[PDB]
Design an enzyme around this catalytic site. Structure first.
Site, PDB file in Angstrom:
ATOM      1  CG  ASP A  49      -2.238  -0.721   0.951  1.00 10.19           C
ATOM      2  OD1 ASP A  49      -2.649  -1.529   1.810  1.00 10.19           O
ATOM      3  OD2 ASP A  49      -2.848  -0.491  -0.113  1.00 10.19           O
ATOM      4  CB  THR A  82      -0.837   7.083  -3.162  1.00  7.16           C
ATOM      5  OG1 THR A  82      -0.536   5.818  -2.561  1.00  7.16           O
ATOM      6  CG2 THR A  82      -2.328   7.363  -3.024  1.00  7.16           C
ATOM      7  CB  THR A  83       2.795   3.821  -5.953  1.00  4.09           C
ATOM      8  OG1 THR A  83       1.907   3.321  -6.960  1.00  4.09           O
ATOM      9  CG2 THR A  83       2.389   3.255  -4.601  1.00  4.09           C
ATOM     10  CG  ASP A 380      -9.048   0.287  -3.623  1.00  2.78           C
ATOM     11  OD1 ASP A 380      -8.257  -0.664  -3.461  1.00  2.78           O
ATOM     12  OD2 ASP A 380      -8.803   1.450  -3.237  1.00  2.78           O
TER      13      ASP A 380
END
Ligand SMILES: Nc1ncnc2c1ncn2[C@@H]1O[C@H](COP(=O)(O)OP(=O)(O)O)[C@@H](O)[C@H]1O
Lengths: 513, 514, 512
Positions: A49, A82-83, A380
């Site tokens: 995550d 978010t990566t 999600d």
């Protein structure tokens, strides 16, 4: 303490940013390896995550704190993704430090990146689709659920939970003028059965946490009642104990409690009340006595939970105990106990409500990681269905959007004063890092595959060609039913541009040296 | 393995980059000067790249390869012997970042060859051809390409010599030229430099003798090559000398010994003898010269090997040696000789050489104070060099940085159009072509990045616009300034640079020694 | 263990002042660089203003301490001109440094500096042109041109500029000061249908709702805000205290004994006329029901700034007592409305007897647009206030220093003394504004200073410098000006600081 004057501070900041982004560059895509985390104790967990790892990360830099703060503050509008923003910011900073070695002011590239992102958004807004009706969002529901979830917690597919989560949003979207609230939907988790036992609570479900399951308990109610008067000896938010200097006062209080039980049951039998829930409670001895003598009723209802009990019935309350009648209460429909285990405690599910303001989901598990992955997939799915109902516009994924944006930036860059083309070529080459990393994460060569897909996209039309991480047949995108929201991509691009501008703006000197 | 060849390649690239960066601020007319210090403490100010490249010494394979490449470029073309080093340095800097990622050298070499071929074809298709079958267009091209090498007054001074040297119309517009095969420009001190004219036959500058009349026509050259030195003794004095006896013996050995050889040699017709340089003879017996004064005397000394090679090629004969020679293959051509001075000092004889198979003609120049003779020599050298370079082909183009930017844009669009993993390597070439205009803009005194961007924008908009000016100091069209250059000076340079880069990239592994 | 007196002391003072001069230099123009400052606690702050940086930094040097004290005094007495004075003093020290080691007594340069400052002040006074109600017919064209100049500093929308002009013109009533530190401003969060709204009164933030919150009337005819520091929460009051636990009658007895006093107190505080209770602590669950049963109003969780604004607008009095109150230290309003917009409930207190503060709601429906684009409106309202209050004005930018330098250089060629080089150095040191302005924008000051000197060699107009177009244009037509009173004070302060620095020859230390 010396002061960092010159260009060493910018170099150190870019090096720290690259070292930070190198951790997130490795784990990218669904084929990413499980990352481990261990604290001070012997608790070692494994997960993947971008928000959980960045939360428990320890750094010793002023820029890393601002970076992780900006990464954590923007996560409620994009959901999953978010990566890649960190890798994009790292590549942009690397290109900036590469172009700055020739003697270029950072203000020029910082202002050029603005129009670069602007023209990228303008090009992405024209390459999409807007032919979604009441069928294009209902028939490919299974495909969208399979592309969102995948095959991480359960190898087989799941159609019950997906349809339940879809209906939970459909019953609130069109009912409140195509709008949805985050405080209306709640996520509950408890171990018990299997993962396929997904329940959609239309009303409100409340647990009680019993103490002894062997106690005789029989269900026999048909009307709920809400009261504010002290039905039993209350506890005014004070831990009561043996604060009486006597021995017979205990027996006196026991006899008084028995007489109060008798009076209360005679009043609820002479007026027509049943399961009356108040806002007070007592110790376990009173509940044990009330369950042993006659009539099953359990207290311990202190806290703000009474609020929902004031909304799952339908009416008002009474200010005085001497103001009760057969019309001041509230009628019910089906209020009983539910316990699928038949060996633990009971639960109360309200099946009578005039509105939907506490709809929730119940998913059973068997461990701690499977339930967490299931709740993450559910969150999600909720985020993606909210983004879908907020705007009926999507785009293809895989890695074709970045290549298309880079090609458009390289094409629409003929006229340039002295920095426009430089900024556009320094911003376009940094966009081809996501597909290269996605192809390198598998067992294929990223450079050759990227060059081949770029040649295929520049030769013919139809910009819907990318890479495949599941090792299938062709490299098409419209056949695998893979889709991605465009609002999330816009928000990610805006956040990356803002972070790059904030990094390139704050770079003078530092006080602690 | 892999670490040793990688380190060897890195060291070679670093050495080549250091060699290329040792001299760079010298391209263009506004270049900087450099004071080279000798080993004894003497200093010399210079600005030419070839002199610095040939004066310094360093032991390294890459440095020796670069020196050989520069020498081959100077021998073949003859102009622009400093841009090839910068091109090779840029190509090596690009190959460094190409290999840092992880690309095989074969694909890089193939991409470099393809880019070189594309650039050559673009330069050949972009240049415009001219004509040269007549004399008017040739003279126009000469006077257009000659007014841009030096300053105005030097150009006006060398224009007579230029138009006198360009009049040598021997080859009827062939493929190659022979300007370096039959040309022997001599130098003479004393007199006026205005008295210059093309001379055929042979020109000498040594006095024959100092007797009566020496106006004959006997071949005018003595084809002899045997030894004429006196027999040296075994020691100083073989016996004790005091009174007679020993005096009469040495007197007869000095008078009645070589005279017999002179008599037996003079029995053949055409009594013309000579000798080479007096670098090994201590002293010549004057008695032989006094005895040879009769029955016509003719002797010419101070002759080098190049003079012998020129005489044996212009006339068309072969020298003979040995003493036992009873043939008759030593005559020449008889026409006219015995010349006087041209109102001044310095002896110099000329022979027009009538009825000769070799039509070799040279230019006899003069000067004063040894200041305007070497300058005129270098001027006519550059003149005939550029004349041969122009007559070798027919294509021409203007310089300034516009062709470099055009080739860079063409290579960029080709790498964008062509598909394949090699295209990235081609893109490296697109980043190895904008060095000359940037260096020119930096040496001129303006912003190089802004000028390069403006030139690229103008090339993308109006194709052929302008370039970079030096005299005015701005951006003006080249069509007004009389300055051009042949297409070979760029094509050959690019091909040599690509070949050197491929050779330095294909060589790796370990470097074993003895 | 080594110390001197005279030239070495002055050299050390100049070297110490150069450090604090170079520490703050890039923060001068409108688009200066940001600086992150952190102390030993662990909280960092990003700031770009020179005053905030100078206030959060201490130097253990006497000259630097005096310099920062003079800068703080100038910023507090005026409000503009903190880094420029320091840069001018640093340039003066750098120019006077080479004219000290050559054996020159500094007691002869003070008179030259004073004469140069007096000549510059006289030239500025004789060249300044003031205009205030003398042309442009009716004041409508005057206010139109003022609004146009206000919106000419930053390229924004027309509706935003009109709303800013309205909010800056609707607050000019009883304000007689020279700064906006009286009414102030407050940025709100959230979104609405329009882009910006205006209202007269005190605003509020998000309020927590409970069950049955719609029982109170939405509109009040004559509301009275209850100014009481005490609150009515579950933690304040109590229903059961220290009593003998025996049955249930004692609980009712003690709760009635408490409710009697509670009812007495509430009726005593309500009989005075106050009915709008603004409790600082958040309300509970039964307090709202008890307030709605008596047809009263309840609130909770309010900041101190809102209470101060309400006391200043409505005219409330500070009450330091709970009971035994009167009907004269209470506030009186007129219209109290509650309108919900989006996902929040907004309040409007319109009808205050003292028109002091006004709310300028700027909500566009975003999270980054609220924090950003906040300095442009501040600069616009500051320029508007400076143009309205002050009378004298002149062309801003780098068009007033070059003319003064040229005049000083031309006047220095008519004096036969040692003051010629002093006046020349003083005129040369005055060129530090446009060079720094061009260097801060990432341009080439060498290509602009020559053009400025060529244009000012025989013109003498108001040709300054540009930023967007990157050229040389007339600053009088670009709608950018500056008051002719701040520059004189800044130059006087710089001259006084330079004189005080050059007057110190040595120091004296004392152990015990
Ligand atoms: N008149 C001119 N105008 C513009 N550029 C010139 C002119 N003459 C020479 N140059 C430039 O100078 C460069 C060559 O400089 P230099 O190295 O000194 O001569 P060479 O290359 O013959 O040794 C060429 O690339 C050419 O572009």
């Amino acid at each position: 303490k010396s002061r960092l004057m010159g260009l060493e501070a910018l170099k150190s900041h870019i090096m720290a940013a690259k070292a930070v982004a190198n951790t997130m560059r490795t784990s990218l895509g669904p084929n990413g390896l499980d990352k481990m985390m261990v604290d001070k104790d012997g608790d070692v967990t494994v997960t993947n995550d971008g928000a959980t790892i960045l939360s428990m990360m320890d750094v010793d830099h002023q820029i890393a704190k601002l970076m992780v703060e900006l990464s954590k503050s923007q996560d409620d509008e994009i959901g999953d993704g978010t990566t890649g923003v960190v890798v994009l910011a790292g590549a942009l900073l690397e290109e900036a430090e590469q172009l700055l070695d020739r003697g270029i002011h950072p203000i020029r590239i910082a202002d050029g990146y603005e129009q670069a992102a602007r023209v990228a958004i303008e090009h992405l807004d024209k390459i999409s689709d807007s032919v979604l009706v009441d069928i294009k969002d209902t028939e490919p529901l299974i495909q969208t659920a399979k592309t969102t979830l995948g095959s991480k917690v359960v190898n087989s597919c799941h159609r019950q939970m997906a349809e339940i989560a879809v209906n939970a949003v459909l019953t609130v979207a069109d009912m409140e003028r195509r709008d949805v609230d985050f405080e209306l939907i709640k996520v509950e988790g408890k171990v018990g059965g299997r993962l396929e036992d997904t329940k959609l609570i239309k009303g409100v479900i409340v647990d009680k946490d019993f103490s002894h399951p062997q106690m005789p308990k029989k269900v026999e109610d048909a009307k709920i009642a809400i009261l504010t008067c002290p039905f039993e000896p209350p506890k005014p938010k004070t831990k009561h104990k043996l604060d009486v200097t006597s021995v017979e006062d205990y027996k006196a209080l026991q006899k008084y409690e028995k007489e109060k039980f008798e009076e209360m049951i005679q009043q609820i039998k002479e007026t027509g009340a049943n399961l009356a829930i108040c806002q007070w409670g007592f110790d376990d001895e009173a509940n044990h006595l009330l369950l042993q003598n006659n009539l099953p009723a359990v207290r311990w209802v202190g806290g703000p939970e009474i609020e929902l009990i004031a909304i799952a019935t339908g009416g008002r309350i009474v200010p005085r105990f001497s103001e009760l009648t057969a019309e001041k209460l509230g009628f019910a429909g089906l209020v009983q106990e539910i316990s699928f285990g038949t060996t633990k405690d009971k639960m109360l599910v309200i099946e009578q409500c005039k509105n939907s303001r506490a709809v929730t989901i119940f998913i059973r598990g068997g461990n701690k990681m499977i339930i967490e992955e299931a709740k993450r997939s559910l969150h999600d799915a909720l985020c993606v269905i909210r983004n879908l109902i907020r705007d009926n516009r999507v785009v293809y994924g895989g890695g074709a959007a970045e290549i298309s944006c880079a090609l458009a930036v390289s094409q629409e860059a003929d006229k340039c004063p002295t920095l426009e083309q430089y900024a556009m070529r320094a911003f376009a080459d940094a966009l081809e890092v996501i597909p290269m990393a996605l192809s390198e994460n598998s067992g294929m060569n990223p450079i050759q595959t990227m060059t081949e897909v770029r040649a295929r996209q520049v030769k013919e039309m139809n910009p819907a060609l990318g890479i495949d991480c599941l090792h299938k047949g062709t490299n098409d995108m419209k056949q695998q039913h893979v889709i991605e929201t465009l609002i999330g991509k816009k928000q990610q691009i805006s956040l990356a541009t803002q972070m790059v501008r904030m990094i390139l703006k704050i770079d003078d000197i530092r006080k602690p040296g | 393995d892999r670490d040793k060849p990688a380190q060897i390649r890195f060291s070679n690239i670093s050495a080549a980059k250091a060699v290329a960066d040792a001299i760079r601020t010298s391209l263009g007319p506004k270049g900087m000067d450099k004071m080279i210090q000798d080993g004894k403490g003497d200093v010399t100010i210079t600005n030419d790249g070839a002199t610095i490249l040939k004066q310094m010494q360093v032991l390294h394979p890459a440095a020796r390869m670069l020196v050989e490449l520069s020498k081959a470029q100077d021998i073949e073309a003859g102009d622009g012997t400093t841009s090839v080093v910068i091109i090779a340095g840029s190509l090596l800097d690009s190959c460094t970042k190409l290999l840092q990622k992880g690309i095989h050298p074969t694909i890089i070499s193939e991409s470099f060859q393809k880019a070189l071929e594309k650039g050559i074809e673009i330069l050949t298709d972009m240049s415009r051809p001219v004509e040269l079958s007549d004399r008017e267009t040739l003279l126009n091209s000469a006077t257009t390409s000659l007014n841009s090498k030096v300053v105005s007054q030097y150009s006006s001074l060398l224009s007579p010599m230029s138009v006198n040297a360009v009049m040598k119309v021997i080859d009827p517009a062939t493929a190659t030229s022979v300007d370096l095969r039959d040309i022997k420009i001599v130098k003479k001190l004393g007199g006026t430099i205005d008295d210059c004219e093309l001379v055929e036959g042979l020109v000498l500058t040594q006095k024959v003798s100092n007797s009566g009349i020496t106006r004959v026509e006997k071949a005018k050259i003595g084809l002899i090559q045997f030894c004429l030195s006196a027999p040296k003794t075994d020691m100083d004095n073989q016996i004790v000398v005091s009174d007679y006896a020993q005096m009469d013996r040495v007197l007869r050995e000095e008078r009645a010994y070589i005279l017999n050889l002179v008599k037996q040699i003079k029995k053949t017709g055409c009594n013309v003898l000579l000798i080479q340089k007096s670098i090994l003879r201590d002293a010549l017996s004057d008695l032989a010269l006094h005895f040879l004064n009769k029955m016509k005397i003719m002797v010419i000394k101070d002759i080098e090997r190049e003079d012998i090679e020129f005489i044996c090629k212009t006339i068309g004969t072969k020298p003979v040696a040995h003493i036992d020679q009873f043939t008759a293959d030593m005559l020449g051509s008889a026409e006219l000789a015995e010349e006087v001075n041209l109102n001044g000092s310095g002896k110099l004889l000329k022979i027009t050489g009538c009825a000769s198979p070799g039509k070799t003609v040279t230019i006899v120049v003069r000067g004063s104070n040894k200041l305007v003779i070497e300058e005129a020599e270098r001027s006519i050298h550059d003149a005939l060099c550029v004349i041969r370079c122009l007559v070798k082909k027919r294509a021409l183009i203007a310089g300034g940085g516009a062709p470099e930017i055009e080739l860079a844009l063409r290579l960029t669009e080709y790498s964008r159009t062509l598909s394949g993993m090699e295209s990235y390597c081609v893109r490296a070439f697109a980043d190895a072509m904008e060095v000359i205009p940037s260096t020119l803009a930096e040496n001129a005194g303006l912003n190089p990045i802004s000028t390069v961007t403006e030139l690229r924008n103008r090339h993308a908009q109006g194709e052929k616009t302008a370039g970079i000016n030096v005299r005015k100091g701005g951006i003006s069209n080249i069509l007004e300034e009389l300055v051009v250059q042949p297409l070979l000076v760029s094509v050959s340079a690019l091909t040599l640079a690509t070949e050197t880069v491929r050779s330095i990239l294909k060589i790796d592994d370990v470097v074993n020694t003895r | 263990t080594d110390s001197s007196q005279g030239i070495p002391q002055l050299v050390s003072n100049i070297s110490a002042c150069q450090v604090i001069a170079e520490a703050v230099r890039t923060t001068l123009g409108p688009r200066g660089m940001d600086k992150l400052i952190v102390d030993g606690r662990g909280k960092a702050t990003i700031s770009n203003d020179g005053a905030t940086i100078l206030k959060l930094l201490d130097v253990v040097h006497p000259a630097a301490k005096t310099l920062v004290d003079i800068a703080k005094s100038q910023d507090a007495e005026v409000g503009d001109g903190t880094t420029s004075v320091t840069l001018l003093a640093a340039e003066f020290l750098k120019q006077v440094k080479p004219y000290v080691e050559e054996g020159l007594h500094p007691q002869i340069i003070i008179r030259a500096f004073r004469t140069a400052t007096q000549l510059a002040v006289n030239k500025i006074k004789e060249i300044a042109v003031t205009v205030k109600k003398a042309d442009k017919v009716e004041q409508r064209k005057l206010l139109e041109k003022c609004a146009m100049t206000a919106l000419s500093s930053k390229l924004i929308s027309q509706q935003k500029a009109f709303f800013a002009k309205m909010v800056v013109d609707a607050v000019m009533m009883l304000d007689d000061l020279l700064q906006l530190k009286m009414i102030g401003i407050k940025k709100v969060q959230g979104g609405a249908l329009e882009d910006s709204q205006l209202v007269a009164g005190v605003a509020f933030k998000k309020t927590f709702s409970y069950a049955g919150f719609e029982m109170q009337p939405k509109k009040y005819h004559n509301p009275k805000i209850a100014l009481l520091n005490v609150e009515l929460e579950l933690k304040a009051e109590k229903d059961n205290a220290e009593i003998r636990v025996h049955t249930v009658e004692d609980y009712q007895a003690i709760v009635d004994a408490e409710w009697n006093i509670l009812y007495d107190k509430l009726e005593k505080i309500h009989h005075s006329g106050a009915k709008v209770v603004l409790s600082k602590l958040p309300i509970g669950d039964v307090a709202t029901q008890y307030f709605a049963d008596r047809d009263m109003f309840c609130a909770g969780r309010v900041p101190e700034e809102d209470l101060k604004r309400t006391m200043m607008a409505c005219g409330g009095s500070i009450q330091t007592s709970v009971n035994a109150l009167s009907a004269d230290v209470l506030g009186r309003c007129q219209v109290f409305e509650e309108t919900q917009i989006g996902g929040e409930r907004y309040n409007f207190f319109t009808g205050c007897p003292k028109a002091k503060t006004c709310t300028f709601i700027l909500r566009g429906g975003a999270e980054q647009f609220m924090e950003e684009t906040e300095r442009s409106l501040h600069d616009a309202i500051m320029i508007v206030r400076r143009a309205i209050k002050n009378d004298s004005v002149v062309a801003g930018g780098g068009a007033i220093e070059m003319e003064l330098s040229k005049y000083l250089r031309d006047y220095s060629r008519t004096i036969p003394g040692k003051q010629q080089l002093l006046i020349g150095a003083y005129a040369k040191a005055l060129e530090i504004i446009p060079r720094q302005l061009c260097d801060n924008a990432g341009f080439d000051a060498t290509n602009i200073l020559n053009k400025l000197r060529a244009r000012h060699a025989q013109g003498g107009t108001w040709y300054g410098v540009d930023i967007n177009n990157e050229d040389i244009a007339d600053n009088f037509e670009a709608f950018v000006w500056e008051p002719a009173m701040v520059r004189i004070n800044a130059l006087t302060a710089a001259s006084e600081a330079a004189c005080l620095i050059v007057s110190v020859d040595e120091t004296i230390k004392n152990p015990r």
